[PDB]
């Protein structure tokens, strides 16, 4: 329906992540928290750090409970270590509830906190299977659903501005909405189409066909989900398995061949700039991902524009961008490139993910992002990877 208290409760941008305000402890300590559908721990800075101006002070919370257990979370780009405990947590622009949740109090970190970023912790919204140290550490959303009458569903509208936001603008701008326990109809246009959650660990999905400007990439569909395909608000790019990335970039280069770009642009390293207002959107192709439908032998497609996969960056008055499609050795990641085009419904209760055209997606007068269906697609379970 309508969840006016939760609409426009996010801030941020794809390169720095999107965050929501939360409170921890008694009296409440306000912190900004990165919204991550790609992990399952609620973890906050709990010790001074040069890039933090606030942190969780456990000794000032009367409701703090020590779990007497450490947690070490190393990952590819960095790591954090901390001490497990529980406390009362609320979301000021959220459901009007307070819950007792697990909190990893971060005491040591490496390349986790970012200078200039305005967030102090991370909210892992995925399932217990991938929580650290193990699946016995109940994730925040699981606690929220168990302790209250909040429906087992949340939805995200991540809003890319379509232009770079400076240090002050990114603080004052609306980055989107996280609707906890519902679907807000003002955030999308057209119909919502649902794809099954394949398995409850990451938000895993199955891609059954890929097109670049309507041209079938024509790969064995297992390649698109090798070794998994996930929906991740904590990844900036659309990341594709090595072989898929190679085929996609060849096709995108062919479609945009009226303009030659350096190898560094396609590697996501180098920016490309055009005179103000002259970005040649029309030379770049649309990209469609077909996802398994809820009905046997049925699929639907989501289509994004170069306004989604060319990330605006500051150089001058030129309009500059980085190519935000990159290679993966851990499967497809539908990051903020995908998510900024759509309103995404994480329907945990019905084990499905919904997509609709976002009311805040960036487009031009000639093309728009799309969510369309149905299409007849056979042997879609064969597209899923095993082992
Ligand atoms: C892609 N991705 C995440 N989705 N989450 C993680 C992080 C994302 C960010 C981050 C920072 C800035 C911008 C963006 C965006 N968009 C994301 C910092 S840490 C957490 N994680 C993880 N893994 C295993 C585990 F038991 C617990 N946490 C893996 C990290 C990661 O590389």
Swiss-Prot record:
GO terms for molecular function: amyloid-beta binding; aspartic-type endopeptidase activity; beta-aspartyl-peptidase activity; endopeptidase activity; enzyme binding; peptidase activity; protein serine/threonine kinase binding. Residues 1-387 are extracellular. Its main location: membrane. The active site is at residues 36, 232. Glycans are attached at residues 96, 115, 166, 297. Its EC number is 3.4.23.46. It catalyses: Broad endopeptidase specificity. Cleaves Glu-Val-Asn-Leu-|-Asp-Ala-Glu-Phe in the Swedish variant of Alzheimer's amyloid precursor protein. Inhibited by RTN3 and RTN4. Changing residue 36 to N: Decreases beta-cleaved soluble APP production. DXXLL motif is required for a proper endocytosis and retrograde transport to the trans-Golgi network, as well as for regulation of lysosomal degradation. The transmembrane domain is necessary for its activity. It determines its late Golgi localization and access to its substrate, APP. This is Beta-secretase 1. It comes from Homo sapiens (Human). The lineage of its organism: Eukaryota, Metazoa, Chordata, Craniata, Vertebrata.
